C-alpha cells in the first residue's frame, strides 16, 4: 500500500499541522547546516508537462539535501505520449523509482498516475489544484502571523483570476479554519462546484469563505495574495485580453495594500508579471513575503517527501534477516567470483 | 585499457551467466533495503538521441542506488551535432566522466563512441541491436523458468517485426543455448546476414533458431515475446501501413497465447501500443511478465555498470601511496593556505 | 555577503595563483582515487542558454565528485523567459540552491544574475568573456611549461577571430604577466576598448600584448591557441562567409606550428571545426594539448566551486549551538511524533 499527495481534500487539519511542523523542523536543521540523510539512495521521478522554477528546483534540491536524487523527466525525453500511456508509464516507473511527482496539463493525468502507481505520487500542479503550494503557503503564514493573532483568526484574500492557486489557497485556508475571500471579477470567480467544496471545509473547520467583486472585501486582510492573469499555459490570454478583464481594479498596488491594512502582508505564488497583477512597489516592498514564500516551496516539499517515504516504508517494511542474508551473499560473490 | 558493452557478440555464455548472477545478487540486496555503494562519486554520461523511459531511468536510478550519478545529455543540449563530431565528443567525455552510455539512431555512432573512448561505453539501443535489453530479458527468463525445465530447454518465440529487439532476443537466446523462433511476415523477417549470426551462435551453444511465417510455430513456446510495429523512430510506419502488414495475424491475443500453451509467459520490451501487437487481455493478464521484465531493465543495468567499472579499475588501479600523498597535501593546503 | 566569478577582472594575479594550486591539488587527489567530500549535500543550479559539453559536464561531474549535485536548468524548462525576469529568477534561486552558474547569450544576463543573487554566481560563458576557460587554460599552461621557462616568460598567440575566448585568453595571460598576441584579420581583431583593458593589465603585471595581422607574429609562440570562425551561436557565419574571411591565412596547419617553433604547443577551447581553424594533423598531433586542456575545464571548475563555497561559508558561518539544537529537536519529532 501507499499514500499520495494529489489534493489536500484527503488530509485533515491535524494531518496538515503535522506536515507543517515536520517541514519546519527539517528547515531549521538545514538552515543551521545539518542535512538530515532521511532519503539515502532514494530516487524521485519528476514528470514536468509545463515550465517550472520553484517546484522543479525544490524537488531536485530536496532530494540532494536528504541524501537522494531527483530525475527530471521532460516531455518527449521519455516515452509518454504517442508511444506510451500514462497508465503504463505509472506502472513501469513504480518499478524504477521510489517516489513520483508530476506537473500536468490536465488533472486526470495526475489522478491516473496516482491510481496506477504502487509508489507515492505527488501533484506538482494541475489545471485544478496546487497542493504543494498550499503546504508551502501554510508554512509561510504560520511563520508570519500578525502579533496577537492565531492562524484561524486570520483573513486571507486572493485577488484576481480563479486560478488553480486561487482555489488551492481556498482549500487550505478553509481546511485550517481560517477566513477566505476570493476578490475577483464576474466570469473569473470560483464557480459553484468550487464554492461547495469550500463550504464543506467550513462546516468541519469553523472557517468562512466569500466570493465577490466588491473592492471593500480586501479591508482587514492579514494576507493579500495574487497570481498572474494569463490563465492556463496551453491557452494563455494575451496582454490586451487580460488587461481588459482585470486592470486597474484587480492590480495589487500600494493603494490596495493600505486599504487592506498597514500590517497586511503580500503573497504571490510566482512567477509574477510585474506591472499587471502587482506593482514593483508592492512585490519588492516592506510588506512582501513572497520570497520567503518561494523558499517555503522547498521547505514544504522536503516535508512531503519525508512523510510519504516514511509512510511507505512503515507499510512496506524491509525484512531485516533477508537484508543481512542479501548483503552477505553479495559480498561473497564480489570477493570470490569472476567473469573469467 | 577498458571493456565495452556494445553487443553480446563479444561475450561468452559463461560471461553472460556471471552478469546475470551479479545483477540478481545486487537486486536481492536492494529489494531488501541494502544499497551497495559500489560506484561512490562516479559519474555516468548518458547520451540519448531517442526517447526512453526504462533505459534512461534505469541508468539514472542505478547510479544513485550505487552511490554515483548519471547525467542526461540530451540532443542539442551538448555540442555534438553541427558543432562537434562523435569522435571528439567521445575523447572529451573520456576526460570528464567515468563511464558512458548512448542510445543512438545509427549503430555506427555507438561503435565510434566506444572505439574513441578510453572509458567503458554501453549501447543503450541502436537500429541494429539492444544488448542491455538482452541481459534484462535473460534475468527475467531465469526468474520465470517453467517448473521442471532448464533455461536451455526453453523455446522463445518472437512475434512480428524484425526489430533490433527481435534480433537481440535471438542473439541472447542462441548464445545461452536456447531454442529461438522469429514468427514474422515475409519482408519483415530477420535477413540472411542476421540468420548467419544466429547460426554461428548455435554451432557453439547447441541451441537452435527458425525464421518463419507459419502460425503453428508459436506452439510449445515457453516465452512468447513481441514489440511494436511502427519500425524506426525517425521514419515510423503509420497506423494504416503497419496494420495492413501485421494485423490480425501477428497480434498477440489470448488465442495465440493458448495456442502457444497454457503455461507460456508473455514478454514485451515496452512501450507497447495496446490493441495492435498485443491486446489488453494478454499484456495485463495472468501470464504477462513484462512488468517484471521492465523492472529487470534496472536489475541488468546495475550489474553491467558494476562489472564494467570493476573491470576498468582492475585494469587501471589507483596507486595507493600516491593517493595517500595527494589526500595529505590537499588537507595541508586547505588548512594552511588562503586566497588573501 | 558573497563573491562571484563573472570576470577575472575582479581577481589579482595572487588570487588566480591560489585558484590554480587549489584546483591542481584537488585534481591529484581525484586522479589517484581520493574524492574529497567538500560540498556534501550542496546544490548547484546550472542555467544554460546555449549548447555545451565541457562546461556543463564539468559542473555536473564536479558536484558529484565533491559530494553534491548539479541541476541542469534548460531554457523553457524553467520559468525564465516570457513568464519571469532574470532578477526574479536570481532572487528565487538564491533561496533554493547554494551556488549558481549560467551560460548566457548576452553578458548583461550573467551580471544581473550575479548582482541580484545572495549566493555565489559563476559565468559559464557570455558574448563578452569566458572566465572558467581562463582558469582551465592557466592550469594547462602551468602543467605544460617549456623546459627552462617560467610562466611569465612565455608567449601565447591566439589565431583568428576576436571571440570571447580570444579576449579571455588575453585577460588571463596579461593578468599573469605573460606575453600575449592576437593574430587576426582586419575587422575581426580585438577592438580598442578590449586592448585598453589588456594595457591596464600589463601596467600592473609587466606583461605585454599585441594585436596584428602580420603572419610572422606566431614566431616564438610557446602556446598557439585557436577557436572556431562561425562567431556567435545565435547569428553564425555560414561556411562560405567565414572561409572567405579567414582561409587559408588563419588556418592552424603544421606549417604554422613549425613557424611558431618545434616546441610550441597547440591549444583550442573546443569544440573544433576540423579543416577550418585547425587541421586534423595539428589537433591530433604530437604538440596538441587541447584534450588535456579539455580535462582541465573540470579541474578548474572543481577549484572555483570549492573556493566560492568556502568563501561563502566563512562569510556566513553556521551557528553550531543552533545546529545541535535543530538536529536534536528534529530527532525527537521523528521518534515521538506521528501524523495520526
Ligand atoms: N496560475 C499559475 C500558478 C503558478 C504557480 N507557480 C509555481 O508553482 C512556481 P513554479 O514551480 O512554476 O516556478
Ligand atoms: N523497437 C523498439 C524497441 C524499444 C525497446 N524499449 C526500451 O528499451 C524501453 P525504453 O528505454 O524505450 O523505455
Ligand atoms: N567561441 C566559442 C567558444 C566556445 C568555448 N567552448 C567551451 O566552453 C566548451 P563547451 O562547454 O561549449 O563544450
Ligand atoms: Ni542529477
Active site residue A106: no
User: Who among A43, A76, A322 is closest to B61 (CB)?
Assistant: A43
Round to whole Å and give the CA distance between B284 and B288: 6
Round to whole Å and give the CA distance between A202 and B218: 63
Round to whole Å and give the CA distance between C48 and A25: 34
Round to whole Å and give the CA distance between A161 and C123: 39
Contact call for residues B166 and B158 (beta carbons, < 8 A): yes
Helix and strand counts by DSSP (H, E) for chain A: 12, 9
Round to whole Å and give the CA distance between C133 and C139: 10
Question: Where is C159: in which H helix or E strand?
Answer: strand C155-159
Phi and psi at residue B161, in whole multiples of 5°?
Answer: -80, 150
Q: For residue A180, count CB atoms less than 10 angstroms from its CB and return exposed for 0-12, middle for 13-18, buried for 19 or more.
A: buried
Beta strand C99-103 with C121-123: parallel, antiparallel or unpaired? Answer: parallel
**Which residue ranges of C make up the annotated binding site for putrescine?**
268-271
- Name the nearest CA neighbour of C132 among C313, C301, C259: C301
- Name the nearest CA neighbour of A312 among A122, A47, A32: A122
Question: Where is C156: in which H helix or E strand?
Answer: strand C155-159
The number of residues in chain B equals 340
Contact call for residues A34 and C326 (beta carbons, < 8 A): yes
Contact call for residues A15 and A131 (beta carbons, < 8 A): no
The C-alpha cell that represents A89 in the structure block: 508509464
Contact call for residues B77 and B106 (beta carbons, < 8 A): no
Residue B163 CB coordination number (10 Å): 23
Q: For residue A152, count CB atoms less than 10 angstroms from its CB and return exposed for 0-12, middle for 13-18, buried for 19 or more.
A: middle
- Name the nearest CA neighbour of A139 among A187, A176, A110: A176
Contact call for residues C225 and C157 (beta carbons, < 8 A): yes
Round to whole Å and give the CA distance between B58 and A96: 6
Round to whole Å and give the CA distance between A118 and A317: 14
Contact call for residues C316 and C28 (beta carbons, < 8 A): no
What are the structural domains, with CATH classification, of chain B?
Answer: 1-147+290-314 (3.40.50.1370), 148-289 (3.40.50.1370)
Is the backbone of residue A87 left (phi > 0), alpha (psi -120 to 50) or beta? alpha
Q: For residue B206, count CB atoms less than 10 angstroms from its CB and return exposed for 0-12, middle for 13-18, buried for 19 or more.
A: exposed
Active site residue A274: no
The C-alpha cell that represents B318 in the structure block: 589507483
A43-48: strand order across its sheet: A69-73, A43-48, A99-103, A121-123
Quote the ligand 2 centre to B52 CA distance (angstroms): 6
- Does residue C336 sit at the A interface (CB-CB below 8 Å)? no
Round to whole Å and give the CA distance between A134 and A7: 10
CA distance C339 to chain A (A): 5
Peptide bond preceding C340 in cis form (omega within 30 of 0): no
- Name the nearest CA neighbour of A133 among A172, A181, A184: A172
**Closest protein CA for atom 8 of ligand 1:** A55
DSSP collapsed to 3 states, chain B: CCCCECCHHHCCHHHHHHHHHHHHHHHHHHHCCCCCCCCCCCEEEEEECCCCCHHHHHHHHHHHHCCCEEEEECCCCCCECCCECHHHHHHHHHHHCCEEEEECCCHHHHHHHHHHCCCCEEECCCCCCCHHHHHHHHHHHHHCCCCCCCHHHCEEEEECCCCHHHHHHHHHHHHCCCEEEEECCCCCCCCHHHHHHHHHHHHHHCCEEEEECCHHHHCCCCEEEECCCCCCCCCCCCHHHHHHHHCCCCCECHHHHHHHCCCCEEEECCCCCECCCECHHHHCCCCECHHHHHHHHHHHHHHHHHHHHHHHHHHCCCCHHHHHHHHHHHHHHHHHCCCC
Quote the ligand 2 centre to B240 CA distance (angstroms): 22
The C-alpha cell that represents C183 in the structure block: 593574430
- Name the nearest CA neighbour of A301 among A13, A1, A15, A26: A26
Experimental method: X-ray
Contact call for residues C9 and C66 (beta carbons, < 8 A): no
Search chain B and give the residue with CA nearest C37.
B41
Residue A330, C-beta contacts closer than 8 angstroms, at least 6 positions apart:
B25, B26, B28, B29, B34, B36
Our CA dihedral for C182, C188, C194, C198, rounded to 10 degrees, sits at: 0
Contact call for residues C157 and C222 (beta carbons, < 8 A): no
- Of ligand 1's atoms, which has the minimum distance to the CA of residue A231? 1
A272 with C323: Cβ contact below 8 A: no
Cα maximum dimension of chain B: 82
Residue pointed to by grid coordinates 519529532? C333
User: Who among B73, B83, B96 is closest to C58 (CB)?
Assistant: B96
CA B306 from chain center: how many Å? 15
Contact call for residues C120 and C288 (beta carbons, < 8 A): no
Round to whole Å and give the CA distance between C134 and A204: 64
Q: For residue C259, count CB atoms less than 10 angstroms from its CB and return exposed for 0-12, middle for 13-18, buried for 19 or more.
A: middle
The C-alpha cell that represents A187 in the structure block: 466570469
- Does residue B333 sit at the C interface (CB-CB below 8 Å)? yes
Contact call for residues A196 and A157 (beta carbons, < 8 A): no
- Name the nearest CA neighbour of B299 among B69, B7, B25: B25
- Name the nearest CA neighbour of A179 among A219, A132, A238: A219
Search chain C and give the residue with CA nearest A306.
C334
Round to whole Å and give the CA distance between A161 and A169: 12
A11 secondary structure, DSSP code: -
B77 with C52: Cβ contact below 8 A: yes
Round to whole Å and give the CA distance between A137 and A294: 9
Residue C311 CB coordination number (10 Å): 16
The tally of CA atoms less than 13 A away on the side-chain side of residue C220 is 9
Round to whole Å and give the CA distance between A169 and A181: 10
DSSP collapsed to 3 states, A97-156: CCEEEEECCCHHHHHHHHHHCCCCEEECCCCCCCHHHHHHHHHHHHHCCCCCCCHHHCEE
H-state helical runs in chain C: 13-31, 54-65, 86-96, 107-116, 131-143, 164-175, 192-205, 239-246, 254-260, 280-283, 290-315, 320-336
A5 secondary structure, DSSP code: B
Phi and psi at residue C237, in whole multiples of 5°?
Answer: -65, 140
Round to whole Å and give the CA distance between A95 and A118: 9
Give C 54-113 residues with CB within 8 A of chain A. 68-69, 71-73, 76-81, 83-85, 88-89, 91-93, 95-97
Residue pointed to by grid coordinates 485550517? A176
Question: Where is C44: in which H helix or E strand?
Answer: strand C43-48
Active site residue A280: no
Rg (alpha carbons) of chain A, rounded to whole number: 22
Round to whole Å and give the CA distance between B51 and A20: 39
Round to whole Å and give the CA distance between A62 and A303: 9
- Name the nearest CA neighbour of B60 among B101, B89, B31, B20: B101
**DSSP-based three-state secondary structure for C181:** strand
Residue C245, C-beta contacts closer than 8 angstroms, at least 6 positions apart:
C185, C187, C188, C229, C237
Round to whole Å and give the CA distance between C24 and B289: 52
The C-alpha cell that represents C207 in the structure block: 606583461
Beta strand B265-268 with B223-226: parallel, antiparallel or unpaired? Answer: parallel
- Name the nearest CA neighbour of A172 among A136, A146, A145: A136
Cross-strand bridge partners of residue B84: B80
**DSSP-based three-state secondary structure for C142:** helix
Contact call for residues C33 and B323 (beta carbons, < 8 A): yes
Contact call for residues C64 and B69 (beta carbons, < 8 A): yes
Q: How far is CA C242 from CA B257, C160, C239, C249, in A?
A: 63, 11, 6, 12
- Measure the N-to-C terminal CA separation of chain A; round to a whole number of Å: 43
Residue B307 CB coordination number (10 Å): 19
Round to whole Å and give the CA distance between B266 and B282: 7
DSSP string for residues in C46-113: EEESS--SHHHHHHHHHHHHTT-EEEEE-TTTSSBTTTB-HHHHHHHHHHH-SEEEEE-SSHHHHHHH
Q: For residue A236, count CB atoms less than 10 angstroms from its CB and return exposed for 0-12, middle for 13-18, buried for 19 or more.
A: middle
Amino acid at each position: 500500500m501507499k499514500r499520495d499527495y494529489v489534493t489536500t481534500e484527503t488530509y485533515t487539519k491535524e494531518e496538515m499541522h503535522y506536515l507543517v511542523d515536520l517541514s519546519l523542523k527539517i528547515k531549521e536543521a538545514i538552515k543551521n547546516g545539518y542535512y538530515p540523510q532521511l532519503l539515502k539512495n532514494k530516487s524521485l521521478g519528476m514528470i514536468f508537462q509545463q515550465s517550472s522554477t520553484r517546484t522543479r528546483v525544490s524537488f531536485e534540491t530536496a532530494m540532494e539535501q536528504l541524501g537522494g536524487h531527483g530525475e527530471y523527466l521532460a516531455p518527449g525525453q521519455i516515452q509518454l505520449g504517442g508511444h506510451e500511456t500514462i497508465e503504463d508509464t505509472s506502472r513501469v516507473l513504480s518499478r524504477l523509482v521510489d517516489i513520483l511527482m508530476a506537473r500536468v496539463e490536465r488533472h486526470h493525468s495526475i489522478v491516473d498516475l496516482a491510481n496506477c502507481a504502487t509508489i507515492p505520487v505527488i501533484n506538482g500542479m494541475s489545471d485544478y489544484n496546487h497542493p504543494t503550494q498550499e503546504l508551502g503557503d501554510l508554512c509561510t503564514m504560520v511563520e508570519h502571523l500578525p502579533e496577537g493573532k492565531k492562524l484561524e483568526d486570520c483573513k486571507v484574500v486572493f485577488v484576481g483570476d480563479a486560478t488553480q492557486v486561487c482555489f488551492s489557497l481556498g482549500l487550505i485556508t478553509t481546511k485550517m479554519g481560517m477566513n477566505f475571500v476570493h476578490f475577483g471579477p464576474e466570469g473569473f470567480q470560483l464557480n459553484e462546484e468550487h464554492q461547495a467544496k469550500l463550504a464543506k471545509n467550513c462546516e468541519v473547520s469553523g472557517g468562512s469563505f466569500l466570493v465577490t467583486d466588491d473592492a471593500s472585501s480586501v479591508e482587514g486582510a492579514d494576507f493579500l495574495y495574487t497570481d498572474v492573469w494569463y490563465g492556463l499555459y496551453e491557452a494563455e490570454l494575451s496582454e490586451e485580453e487580460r488587461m481588459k478583464v482585470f486592470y486597474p481594479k484587480y492590480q495589487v498596488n500600494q493603494e490596495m495594500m493600505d486599504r487592506a491594512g498597514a500590517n497586511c502582508k503580500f503573497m504571490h505564488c510566482l512567477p509574477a508579471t510585474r506591472g499587471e497583477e502587482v506593482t514593483d512597489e508592492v512585490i519588492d516592498g516592506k510588506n512582501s513575503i513572497c520570497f520567503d514564500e518561494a523558499e517555503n516551496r522547498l521547505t514544504s516539499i522536503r516535508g512531503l517527501l519525508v512523510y510519504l517515504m516514511n509512510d511507505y516504508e512503515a507499510k512496506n517494511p524491509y525484512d531485516l534477516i533477508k537484508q543481512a542474508e542479501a548483503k552477505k551473499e553479495l559480498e561473497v560473490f564480489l570477493d570470490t567470483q569472476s567473469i573469467s
